[PDB]
Amino acid sequence: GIPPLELGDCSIAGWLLGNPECDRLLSVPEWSYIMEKENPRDGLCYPGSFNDYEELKHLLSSVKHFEKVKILPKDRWTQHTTTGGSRACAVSGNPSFFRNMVWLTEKGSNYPVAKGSYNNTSGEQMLIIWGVHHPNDETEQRTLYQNVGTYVSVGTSTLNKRSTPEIATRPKVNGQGGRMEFSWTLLDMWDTINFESTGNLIAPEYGFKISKRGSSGIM
Numbered sequence: 001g002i003p004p005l006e007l008g009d010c011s012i013a014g015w016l017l018g019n020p021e022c023d024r025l026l027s028v029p030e031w032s033y034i035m036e037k038e039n040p041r042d043g044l045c046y047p048g049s050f051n052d053y054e055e056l057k058h059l060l061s062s063v064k065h066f067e068k069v070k071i072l073p074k075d076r077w078t079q080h081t082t083t084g085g086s087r088a089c090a091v092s093g094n095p096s097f098f099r100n101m102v103w104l105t106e107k108g109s110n111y112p113v114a115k116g117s118y119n120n121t122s123g124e125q126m127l128i129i130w131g132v133h134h135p136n137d138e139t140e141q142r143t144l145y146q147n148v149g150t151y152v153s154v155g156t157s158t159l160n161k162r163s164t165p166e167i168a169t170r171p172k173v174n175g176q177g178g179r180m181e182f183s184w185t186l187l188d189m190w191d192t193i194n195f196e197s198t199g200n201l202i203a204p205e206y207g208f209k210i211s212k213r214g215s216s217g218i219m
């Protein structure tokens, strides 16, 4: 009291993305510090990578509480399918997905340009994560996103990242040759994040407003 946040089997990635095995951590109160195991099992259910992961762990050492803000409600994506799930993130024998993320896919045999924006009027700096899906092959690319030749652009006043998916056969991990590469940014108060993609975007539905700052950290 104030108690630590013990992640148990969950990694910081699993917690923030909302790996379904980490559902116990969907809403957490203020903590004194964060306790993570040396090699947590529950991280990226759909396999992949997380850019600047150590730097995110260092930022979390100075955060003592988050408030999840619904920055991009799933219903806003009216021209895309948002129900996308995988057996890699299965819940009760059914395909599912990261709780805080949205897999945008083709709807009615079309993937029109996906655009979304959020103005940080939350009252504090906000951590936002998004992903890029790197399929296993061109057949997978066309099935999910209609065509080969796509991009994912994310921008703020301090960020300009415009990614191209890498289509490549890979050894199966968690039943998948595809990979999802996640990145993060800190959106300043009153700044706007803009998302634009012609395919392969794993959009956040939530952002994490930094509600309490303080020293102690991550064990």
Ligand SMILES: *[C@@H]1O[C@H](CO)[C@@H](O)[C@H](O)[C@H]1NC(C)=O
Pocket: 119, 120, 121, 190, 191, 192
């Ligand atoms: C974001 O919201 C703040 C509200 O205080 C406003 O000052 C600013 O104009 C907004 N950004 C845009 C792009 O409208």
